[model samples]
Target: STRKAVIGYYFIPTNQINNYTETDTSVVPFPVSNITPAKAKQLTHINFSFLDINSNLECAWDPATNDAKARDVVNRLTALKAHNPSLRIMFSIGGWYYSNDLGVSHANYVNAVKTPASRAKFAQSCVRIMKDYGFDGVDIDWEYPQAAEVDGFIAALQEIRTLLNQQTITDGRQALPYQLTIAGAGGAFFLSRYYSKLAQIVAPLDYINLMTYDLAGPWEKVTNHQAALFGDAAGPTFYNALREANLGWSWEELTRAFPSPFSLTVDAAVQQHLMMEGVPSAKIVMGVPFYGRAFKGVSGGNGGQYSSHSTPGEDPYPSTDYWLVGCEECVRDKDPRIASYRQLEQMLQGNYGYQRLWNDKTKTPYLYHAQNGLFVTYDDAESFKYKAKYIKQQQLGGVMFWHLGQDNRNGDLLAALDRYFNAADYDDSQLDMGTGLRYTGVGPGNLPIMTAPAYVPGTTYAQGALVSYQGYVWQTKWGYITSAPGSDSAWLKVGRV
Candidate 1:
């Protein structure tokens, strides 16, 4: 009763920001363009959508002022689908930019979608668009659907599903029934206040991808990015200092303390709200950021900025920019952050006393590092293995990543996932049969009829079903039948007919 982990990659075409041409010669800088087909075959699903959908539910035209970009994306995705039959491609609509303007649009569409005629038209249009573009389904990334838009959003989704079902029935095709999905903030604001209403509306959704990252940034008073699941224990201690600067020892020493407790608590609260909303554990794909943030100006000692908390660090190398690594320009070019991440992974695998920490409250694994001011709350291979195991144990859907391009292409993380899934398959006794039979001779017509000994049904005779071919009883299935039965011929038809 375990759930098979569904691994997917989100392909955000940021390089195609303005140039939306249909030609392969376009100067899109997406890494996927460089990746070979063989590499892409490794993924089970790909969500490709970086274009803005207008209030009219139409995709934005590229700088070319043509809809050819849609065709190009569809063609590319279809080719990928052809290469991997099981691959599911979802067209993601709306992202950060789309969210900014969603509030106003939702109000306009809310009233319009109420009428049966308008709803039908909208649903039909969506289906037509998806089918024409070769997408399996649509992934609605409507930033945060407020309380007012919740009802209308759900109704629209239902209408879309209804249309999809009708289309499938009419065409007698095996198409999906509308891959209902949403992207919501991971913190208490969205999860605690709005998830219940949203969940009620889209209970039929495939999965809710939690945007778990971005809890803390340069703008925050205190610099900590881990965004842990539980509430921070250091808050009281820090606040108690207001009465007496020496209450928690010198302010200098207090400032040096790490932010482990705070990050863990924040993450815990987010997870708690997800479960509280009755969101099926499997339907919740915990979001992990491929990038990490940096902080600067920490004279007191914690490394994080106590005041003006800016982690001005740069990539260790000179080939990339800040957006590529989620760090400020000043930090990325000079710091040893990437090297530190590699070292941290090694330390966790070797020195971390606990193999796994079972988060009973959220049912997730967490690691805490107090040595360095860094609190990396991302899921590593080991953590993912535990998560995969837990998913199988709980019969949950699977795992997904924010973006595929960020993964170590050498398969560090993927190998662990592959091993876990394959091992799970083995544990579940799902491997293919390994019958030991060999082909001997072929006929003029090339009809390869197997010559293995036929045993009586429900018989307990296990010694290779003794057959009176000539004299001796063959020890193997192949030996039991052959052209020369009396000879040492233990062969059967092994080649395809």
Candidate 2:
């Protein structure tokens, strides 16, 4: 009875933990205290939105801006473990603005992974911070790194993993392993550009938190689902859409670089790109978003699905750092253009004159206000159910959604996720334990623990026999097993011992 992964990202920038209504009056804030025991029970992990790398190129808190506020929020969030001992709290580092060139440059993250000494220093500081903050693990959210930095980044990850393991021995809690994950992209551009090599050597990661949402947004020329399970050929492909927005790469060059089929959908990105590049299924924690993207002046076709959006003008503010005043990206969090599920609930009411449309082809939902040409792509109870089943059927690690504050006061989105993701009827007996080394009850990211007897050739094993092979535990489905595990389908990966 291994349960599916149910991870929630609690963003700090907007005080998602505490109640603070965004400018959108239709939305109500959901505080950590307000997360009822039942709702909290659904979550296996809560990644604190971000822990910044300071000017010293070390993972540290700056007292000037976010230290005091983060300290208070950290206390409230860590306390939730009382509700569910299984809930693991972790701090994520270097999100889009901090790590990407398109956003404000912190320069700390960029410089930290450049050399061995710098990487070691960064990993040490991160571990120290993790220990002090009472976090179960740390998640790296470096938006991207160049090909030259790949080796250094992986080495840094290995350093972090090693230190995490060493710390367990130091604290005499070897039984409880610390987790490590990264906010990985779910599109070809990012997957091929930054993670192709990293995915090959995932020994340091428990699972890659696949940020599967945001496949479509205001930047696109057409309205598209933020997280569709499958690709829509008519919709713009990865490079095509971004090129239209003048993100730099020419369409011809991008196409030549990645000739294989690529799209702004979850399936193509995961199955065709990430997994194909060597990321084990067990080590991929797929992400869903609690919020949805909206567009105005949508073409009056396909109910605004795959229709060109009129508001495709350049962002006057462009990508800016979080600390900068009037940060366009930060301020856009309040605009109705990016509506949270709570806000969408109010907008979806019959009184709003927005018709709810379902795209069966993509297994997603959208809203269209014909009169005003408002079209929005969002997920609801129905869409989430399909996603849950998709995850199970595909043997994916589990579902990780964006911030929690967006869910309505009643926790509608969370409830929907719990209903299907944690559905009692779904049988996980045959689920492919991806890398077959997950921590089981601890979800993913814990180092594998070998506990079963080593397998030997010519052994007459009976049905349901558990054997350790190739650093993972496999369950024999039938008797008289002579072939080694993973030779055929008779062996069911149970996870690392």
Candidate 3:
């Protein structure tokens, strides 16, 4: 079976570009130097995040202002060419801080992309910046755009795609077929309402990077795990979370061509990103945090979920708390500090109030030391284990780490990702050892017909399943169907059959 990358991304403290990993004894700027060779090798795609999309204020074409910050990352990433020649390094533009913009949101994005001239100029700038910074692709981390601006988002991406393709042919300097991916919110409100607005939308981007973490934070003073794999259909999940706010949603309100429990969630985020976004499985990538979200005060165990707390907990709306909420200002949770996974482990050391306990339903861990009332929720190697399994099961694009430095000194969590992906378990010898009784005959489509059968669009094929498509037989790269022999891009593509 063909497998894709075990990818990782780098998102950091406010404006520390050189400290991409946010760890180092020196002023050294290279992020790779912060991690071990093994950990670096395990990552197939390394995204250099937030290349100052504000520089272009209109459509994320900030190359003129952000390339210098991107240079070192490009330098360090390309140096690992031997690690995997296929290794890709992309630049992420836009972020929650800017898009959400304190008091008034969308001012920057809407202002920039409000016109055709801005969208085109921004696209042109992206092409220039990508080549200048040696980026393989671009990531749009629009915190994000609203229903009204949905078409504008699509238009911008299409413009960027056309430019990327045309520029590649003109100079052949950029990484060919440059990728365009978006980082989108995974809440049910985001899915249920926005997907309808997006029905009239389609873009030429690679895939949508679903931001699945931060399920709980200062937004809710109640301690809660920021990202849980699976949990009750109650408040923890997006499906149910929507009903609390909408007073308008029911299980029947959303499309059922997918999983159950319509809720705001981490695992189910992929489900919505699938049915709601209507993108291919391979085009989706699960986002995992290398950090923990903590609430410092009197609180309940299991991160204040299903329990009351001293701080502002659940508010149907955000204005009640005056907290700068998410796109929807949906729920209230703890506003947490970005603690590394290492911090989570240390919280368990010598038995502090931060004692560790696992949440069985969500398949994650949390800490709540009642003596002083400090509750923290986070993901560790164990979470990565099942997260890896989910990626493989759903055949997603890959796992994306928020920031590389959050992994401990031993790089334990990063290692866990590789182990679960079974990188070393790959064995290709079976490919050459075919049946000797194969009869030489031109079958339908003139492809080498296998005993398996012809391509069936309705049949769901697992990775490595063989099928004949358009005179040439092909094998499935993931859990999919209706896709043919070659050139299948997520959220966009084609098949030979």
Clashes of each: 27, 3, 26
TM-score between candidate 3 and the true structure: 0.70
| Per-residue lDDT over 162-247 for candidate 1, one digit per residue giving the tens place of the 0 to 100 score | 76677767666564344656565665444433544545654756776667655655435565443333333332112211112112
Lowest summed lDDT across 10 adjacent residues in model 2 is found at 435-444
Error at 348, model 3, angstroms: 2.3
Best by TM-score: 2
Clashes of 3: 26
- lDDT tens digits, residue span 1-497, model 3: 44545557764433445344435534433256665566667777777766545544533333333445546656776676556666677878777655653413347577666679878877777777788767878777777666667677778888888887777677775654677777767665555434543323334766666678888776663456678777543344333332332223233232223233443456666754454334667777788888776555555534455444554433222234322112111121223344677655655664544567777667677776666566667898877766677777778877777777667778788788877776578433332211111111111112222443566655666666665555445655456555554544211111133
Better of 1 and 2 by lDDT: 2
List all candidate RMSDs to the true structure.
Answer: 21.0, 11.0, 11.9
What TM-score goes with each of the models? 0.60, 0.75, 0.70
Candidate 2 deviant stretches above 4 angstroms: 14-28, 66-69, 238-261, 273-278, 312-334, 425-497
Q: How many backbone clashes does candidate 1 have?
A: 27
Question: Candidate 3 regions off by >4 Å?
Answer: 12-30, 55-70, 101-105, 170-176, 197-203, 233-263, 298-305, 311-336, 424-497
